[PDB]
Amino acid sequence: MGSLEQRRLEQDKRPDDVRDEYDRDEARLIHSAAFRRLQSKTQVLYRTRLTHSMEVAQIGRGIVQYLSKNKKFAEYHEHLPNTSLITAICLAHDIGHPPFGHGGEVALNYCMREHGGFEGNGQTLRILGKLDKYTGEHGLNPTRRMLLGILKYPVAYSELVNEKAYEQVPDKNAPYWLFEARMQKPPKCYHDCDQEIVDFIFDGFAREELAKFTQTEQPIDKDEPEKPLHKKSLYKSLDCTIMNLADNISYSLHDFEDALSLGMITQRHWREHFEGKEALFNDLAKQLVRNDLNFDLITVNLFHKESHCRKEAIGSLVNLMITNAIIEKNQSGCENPLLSLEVKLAPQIEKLRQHIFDLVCEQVIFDENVQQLEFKGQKLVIELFQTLAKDPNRFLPKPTRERLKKAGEGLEGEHKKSAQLRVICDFVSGMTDDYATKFYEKLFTPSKGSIF
Amino acid sequence: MGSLEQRRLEQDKRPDDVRDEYDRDEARLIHSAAFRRLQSKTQVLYRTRLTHSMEVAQIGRGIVQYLSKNKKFAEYHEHLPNTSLITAICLAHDIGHPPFGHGGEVALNYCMREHGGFEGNGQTLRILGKLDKYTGEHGLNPTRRMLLGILKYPVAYSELVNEKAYEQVPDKNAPYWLFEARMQKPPKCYHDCDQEIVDFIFDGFAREELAKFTQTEQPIDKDEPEKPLHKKSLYKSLDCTIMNLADNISYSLHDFEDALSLGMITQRHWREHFEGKEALFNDLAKQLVRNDLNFDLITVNLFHKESHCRKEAIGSLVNLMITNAIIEKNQSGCENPLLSLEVKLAPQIEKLRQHIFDLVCEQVIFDENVQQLEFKGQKLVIELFQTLAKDPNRFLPKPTRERLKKAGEGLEGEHKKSAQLRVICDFVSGMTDDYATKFYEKLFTPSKGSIF
Ligand SMILES: [Mg+2]
Ligand SMILES: [Mg+2]
Numbered sequence: 001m002g003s004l005e006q007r008r009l010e011q012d013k014r015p016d017d018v019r020d021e022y023d024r025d026e027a028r029l030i031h032s033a034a035f036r037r038l039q040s041k042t043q044v045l046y047r048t049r050l051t052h053s054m055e056v057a058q059i060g061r062g063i064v065q066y067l068s069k070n071k072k073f074a075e076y077h078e079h080l081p082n083t084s085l086i087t088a089i090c091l092a093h094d095i096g097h098p099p100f101g102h103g104g105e106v107a108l109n110y111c112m113r114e115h116g117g118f119e120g121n122g123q124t125l126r127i128l129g130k131l132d133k134y135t136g137e138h139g140l141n142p143t144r145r146m147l148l149g150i151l152k153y154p155v156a157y158s159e160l161v162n163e164k165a166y167e168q169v170p171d172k173n174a175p176y177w178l179f180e181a182r183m184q185k186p187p188k189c190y191h192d193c194d195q196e197i198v199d200f201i202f203d204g205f206a207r208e209e210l211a212k213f214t215q216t217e218q219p220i221d222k223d224e225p226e227k228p229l230h231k232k233s234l235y236k237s238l239d240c241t242i243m244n245l246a247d248n249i250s251y252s253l254h255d256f257e258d259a260l261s262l263g264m265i266t267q268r269h270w271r272e273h274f275e276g277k278e279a280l281f282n283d284l285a286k287q288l289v290r291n292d293l294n295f296d297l298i299t300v301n302l303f304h305k306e307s308h309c310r311k312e313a314i315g316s317l318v319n320l321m322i323t324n325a326i327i328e329k330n331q332s333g334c335e336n337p338l339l340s341l342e343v344k345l346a347p348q349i350e351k352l353r354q355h356i357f358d359l360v361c362e363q364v365i366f367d368e369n370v371q372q373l374e375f376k377g378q379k380l381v382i383e384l385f386q387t388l389a390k391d392p393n394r395f396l397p398k399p400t401r402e403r404l405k406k407a408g409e410g411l412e413g414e415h416k417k418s419a420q421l422r423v424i425c426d427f428v429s430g431m432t433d434d435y436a437t438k439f440y441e442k443l444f445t446p447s448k449g450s451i452f
Numbered sequence: 453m454g455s456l457e458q459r460r461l462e463q464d465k466r467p468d469d470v471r472d473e474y475d476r477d478e479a480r481l482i483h484s485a486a487f488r489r490l491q492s493k494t495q496v497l498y499r500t501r502l503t504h505s506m507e508v509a510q511i512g513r514g515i516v517q518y519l520s521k522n523k524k525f526a527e528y529h530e531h532l533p534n535t536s537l538i539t540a541i542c543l544a545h546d547i548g549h550p551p552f553g554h555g556g557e558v559a560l561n562y563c564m565r566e567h568g569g570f571e572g573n574g575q576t577l578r579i580l581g582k583l584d585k586y587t588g589e590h591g592l593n594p595t596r597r598m599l600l601g602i603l604k605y606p607v608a609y610s611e612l613v614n615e616k617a618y619e620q621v622p623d624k625n626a627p628y629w630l631f632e633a634r635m636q637k638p639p640k641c642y643h644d645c646d647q648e649i650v651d652f653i654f655d656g657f658a659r660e661e662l663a664k665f666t667q668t669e670q671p672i673d674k675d676e677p678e679k680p681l682h683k684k685s686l687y688k689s690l691d692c693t694i695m696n697l698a699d700n701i702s703y704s705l706h707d708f709e710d711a712l713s714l715g716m717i718t719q720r721h722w723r724e725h726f727e728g729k730e731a732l733f734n735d736l737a738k739q740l741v742r743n744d745l746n747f748d749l750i751t752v753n754l755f756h757k758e759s760h761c762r763k764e765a766i767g768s769l770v771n772l773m774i775t776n777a778i779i780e781k782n783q784s785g786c787e788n789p790l791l792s793l794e795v796k797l798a799p800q801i802e803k804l805r806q807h808i809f810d811l812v813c814e815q816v817i818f819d820e821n822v823q824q825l826e827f828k829g830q831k832l833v834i835e836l837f838q839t840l841a842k843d844p845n846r847f848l849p850k851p852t853r854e855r856l857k858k859a860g861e862g863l864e865g866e867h868k869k870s871a872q873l874r875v876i877c878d879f880v881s882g883m884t885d886d887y888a889t890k891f892y893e894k895l896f897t898p899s900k901g902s903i904f
Contacts, residue, residue: 176625451821
């Protein structure tokens with residue numbers, strides 16, 4: 001089998017470069033157009049995706065550091081990623097996310113219904129492995145282990161999608177962009193047209209390991225037992241578990257901290273969301289003997305006037321989760337360490353992390369005004385994709401027109417159409433929020449737009 | 453037959469006026485609302501249609517002057533138009549063009565699919581002969597020869613249209629304004645509802661002359677031999693050939709000069725568009741012995757920092773085409789001089805003029821941002837026409853409501869509908885780009901519009 005430091009394309013380093021291949025991955029990523037676009041992309045609307053990706057990289061390094069010295073896990077030290085690989089994986093995890101976030105993701109998936117759908121994490125793999133113009137046709141040409149580390153869902157769209165969930169009540173009067181977004185969310189997956197990339201990631205493993213590692217589950221009873229739902233992938237690589245843990249800690253605490261600052265989560269919300277289960281903080285305070293973890297003391301410090309009393313509690317909770325990162329084996333039958341080993345929190349810490357994250361989804365993610373803005377990004381992307389798809393040679397830039405022509409060669413009929421719509425999907429998804437707004441305004445908004 | 457200085461309506465001049473009828477045409481045109489609208493109408497988006505029409509008038513006068521003294525063409529001096537007639541024809545040629553240019557023209561033709569279509573040059577005749585409020589129902593009431601001079605395409609829409617080219621792949625999800633504009637372009641023609649105007653222009657000629665002069669051709673193989681295409685008219689009057697030559701010289705050189713200034717055409721584009729065929733400049737430089745026509749010398753002067761080195765080359769190329777205007781006979785079997793005689797460039801000069809014009813279409817006319825703005829004018833005009841057509845008495849001004857009522861009298865059924873939609877088409881097409889934008893914003897844009 002192939003090495004983990006192997007790339008799809010041959011790009012050997014000069015003898016002047018003792019940097020390991022994982023550092024070369026970090027260097028290419030930071031100097032890449034896909035990573036620099038994280039500035040003009042916000043996840044909530046304040047906090048940009050670049051800042052979130054840096055905080056996630058910091059948390060992941062702290063996780064890897066904590067594990068690399070805890071001798072209870074000394075048996076697994078050799079399989080931990082290094083500082084450069086965990087950073088590059090953490091800094092790349094939100095690269096594929098489209099403009100306007102979930103509003104744009106639902107939009108592109110709805111437009112690509114007959115052509116493979118769209119999902120952000122799949123586009124992250126698509127950009128990293130092919131789209132980014134660091135190479136001709138191999139993206140940034142990352143190492144096998146880095147590609148595996150960003151593959152959060154190693155199962156294809158077709159193998160996971162349940163198109164019965166897309167079913168809608170007919171409405172002759174509704175425009176094409178007007179629908180319930182929750183019923184058009186894609187499965188978390190990789191795109192079928194990128195199977196070659198996934199083949200490379202998995203050529204360094206035994207095929208029985210691949211079958212066990214790509215196992216899925218059928219979730220049941222989201223509201224009713226017969227409600228149709230997509231299938232979920234079940235397992236991620238070891239490095240991916242570390243990044244996914246850091247990614248959730250930031251969403252649970254750092255987006256919570258921003259919610260306190262903006263006033264979207266009050267102490268009344270806190271004490272009502274924790275009206276029961278004050279032991280989520282208190283019982284932990286007893287076991288670890290940390291008076292700072294007392295529910296009433298940490299509540300006063302979180303909702304304190306002095307900003308140094310809040311950041312001290314946020315950082316205390318950030319440190320509490322990093323110090324409670326355990327590494328177990330997943331219920332996959334895999335014997336490879338990178339496929340069988342998982343990093344996660346202590347069960348009592350995860351209960352507290354989730355319960356803080358649930359208050360964030362309730363007051364921030366599902367705020368009426370936040371959702372109204374997501375729908376507008378849905379309308380904008382749909383209306384932009386339609387127009388770019390109706391006459392792509394009139395509107396698209398010349399290099400994008402070349403890819404669309406190139407994608408259709410050797411293909412005819414419906415396969416040619418899906419391959420060319422994929423290029424348009426990669427063009428729109430690779431837009432920044434302001435670039436997509438300007439592109440919308442040049443095409444539709446009455447008095448806006450300039451030829452330069 | 454009738455005189456060339458004859459008008460549809462009787463408007464004789466006072467004895468105090470020794471001005472010839474062609475000067476009276478020039479005077480009425482300049483003081484007309486249709487000609488003054490050329491200020492608020494741009495052709496590219498910089499250079500307005502008024503400025504283009506003045507440069508065309510200057511080139512045409514230079515053409516007529518050059519021919520009126522070249523004794524190789526002395527046999528045809530008596531049939532050349534005078535200074536006033538060639539100016540009025542040149543200043544009127546773009547009067548009918550709608551807001552947003554081709555974007556608005558494709559829009560109106562698409563809306564008028566079942567009602568006669570729309571084309572700019574046809575509206576120029578419609579405004580000049582009927583619409584302009586200089587008279588009651590005869591427009592500016594121009595002379596027969598001036599009307600003939602603006603009749604670039606003396607064949608009707610119905611006689612030229614190939615509705616198979618309008619055929620579209622069905623799309624249930626597309627809004628009414630979303631289509632490929634290239635497949636909805638109208639034929640270059642005059643509108644069927646203006647046949648009476650064309651009858652007057654042609655009552656001063658023998659009917660055999662009319663049949664030969666209105667001959668058409670069926671172009672073949674735009675991309676494939678079986679691609680459906682409209683039919684083209686074949687012949688223009690002598691005065692029209694002079695105006696059409698001046699009109700093309702301005703587009704080929706003056707719009708090229710603006711392209712240099714804005715940076716849309718680089719010296720790299722020039723030397724790559726002329727990578728072969730440097731003899732288009734050089735061979736002419738040999739025959740005429742003009743070292744300024746050397747490809748490398750004129751390239752340095754065109755792309756020079758000093759603006760006096762560029763304008764000296766542009767004006768040299770403007771002068772080179774005027775000095776190479778020849779007058780031949782067209783392959784029409786006509787014996788009337790105004791219908792059989794044509795003015796055009798020398799074959800080697802036309803090869804150079806076209807090749808410069810092709811670089812203008814490639815970098816300017818078909819720039820992605822220029823086309824994106826054209827589509828937005830297409831969407832705006834379509835959405836404006838629809839709403840004005842749904843309830844014309846609620847929205848249209850009282851004088852326009854009078855014409856629409858008046859156009860429907862004596863008619864019922866589908867003929868009444870087409871006659872009233874023609875008035876709405878004349879209202880929208882006669883809008884300036886900013887007037888159409890304000891009219892769009894009052895009706896659709898959320899927070900815009902005032903009752904005054
Ligand atoms: Mg993230
Ligand atoms: Mg013109």
